[PDB]
Amino acid sequence: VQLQESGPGLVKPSGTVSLTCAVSGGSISSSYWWSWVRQPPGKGLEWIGEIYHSGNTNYNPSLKSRVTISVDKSKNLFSLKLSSVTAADTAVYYCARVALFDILTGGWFDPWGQGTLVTVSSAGTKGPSVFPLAPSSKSTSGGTAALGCLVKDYFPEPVTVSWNSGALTSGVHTFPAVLQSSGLYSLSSVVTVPSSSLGTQTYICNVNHKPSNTKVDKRVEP
């Protein structure tokens, strides 16, 4: 059983956060509470609410006025709507499957979705500009060389990077972003490869910016 939440993105103040969690490897009509929990940056876990396949809901009292959550058996998923949002609502939101309280074993949350970062802001979504970071003798260490991609000026987080569509994994190192005073983010991804085959192997970084529905594949040449 696996849970997959819908993708990250921006929500305007007073707007409505709207997320779904697609359930696989099992059925929604199973005897479990399907739940939402959020985690503001640097904070703890905060329960939002839960539904049963029957339709019954339990909500955090402090949020109950703004929260609605529902199910959809035909698509095997459940969803969350949180209205009148403020900057306080900016958080990584998780979906989770919750065991019914059993008198012998108690309850538990398993499994969790991957988490989706929802950012509450007035600024516009902005996709990244990607620039190659070419390998050279100055980025070489004997038998290996470093090369990379600079992912500039995007908003909001997050950005994800793979190399050669995931066929290149060893030696990959994607660095956490800086926030520029402009309000935009930048990061870089570097991969270390054999220095002997720079003229032979093609290297392409696949830069994923889901908030803008953008993916850029940038060829990096020596």
Partner: protein, 207 residues
């Protein structure tokens, strides 16, 4: 339901994360492990029980007002936030979480890689110097930039260090110039000081 914000331990040494609340022993406690950038993972349920897949190194207890998650031969990869969760027949409550640190890890010097502006970025009328810093421990460095030997005191953005998957730290630093500024100096230097010693890398417009 309270936990200590942080606890530290030596490698291979046992650490205890406590969770406390009134009549906690009358409740079933779960424990979750959440590594940075990751989802929480059920590590203990019903006070004592490990889900399939969780290694014996993790164990739990719960007596009186305190529940304890113990991990015996603590490795660097065990660093995480650990949350307890207490169950009634009517409710659950999450603990505030405890960050675990492992301290006496072997010292490691930073690898520094510095890239000049791509020709593509220059034709977009910008110039970013990219200084990437890897494989250092402990996770603290100081970054200074020079242009022809003089300190650059503006236009620099440097991240805080973050853990790599091999348990050493990484950081990055960016110097943002105009193409004009880039071409108007002979040399630029990114200098990374770690534990009193320094690694410098140079780029030059004339290639």
């Amino acid at each position: 339901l309270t936990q200590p914000p942080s606890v530290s331990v030596s490698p291979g040494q046992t650490v205890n994360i406590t969770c406390s609340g009134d009549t906690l022993g009358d409740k079933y406690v779960c424990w979750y492990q959440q590594k940075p950038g990751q989802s929480p993972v059920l590590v203990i349920y019903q006070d004592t029980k490990r889900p399939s897949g969780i290694p014996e190194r993790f164990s739990g207890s719960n007596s009186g007002d305190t529940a304890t998650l113990t991990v015996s031969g603590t490795q660097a990869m065990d660093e995480a936030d650990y949350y307890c969760q207490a169950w009634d027949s009517s409710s659950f409550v999450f603990g505030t979480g405890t960050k675990v640190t492992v301290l006496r890890q072997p010292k490691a010097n930073p690898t520094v890689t510095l890239f000049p502006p791509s020709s593509e970025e220059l034709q977009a009328n910008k110039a970013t110097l990219v200084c990437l810093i890897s494989d250092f421990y402990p996770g603290a460095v100081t970054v200074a930039w020079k242009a022809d030997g003089s300190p650059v005191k503006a236009g620099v953005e440097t991240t805080k260090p973050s853990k790599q998957s091999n348990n050493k730290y990484a950081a990055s630093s960016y110097l943002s110039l105009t193409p004009e500024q880039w071409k108007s100096h002979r040399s630029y230097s990114c200098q990374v000081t770690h534990e009193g010693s320094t690694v410098e890398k140079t780029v030059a417009p004339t290639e």
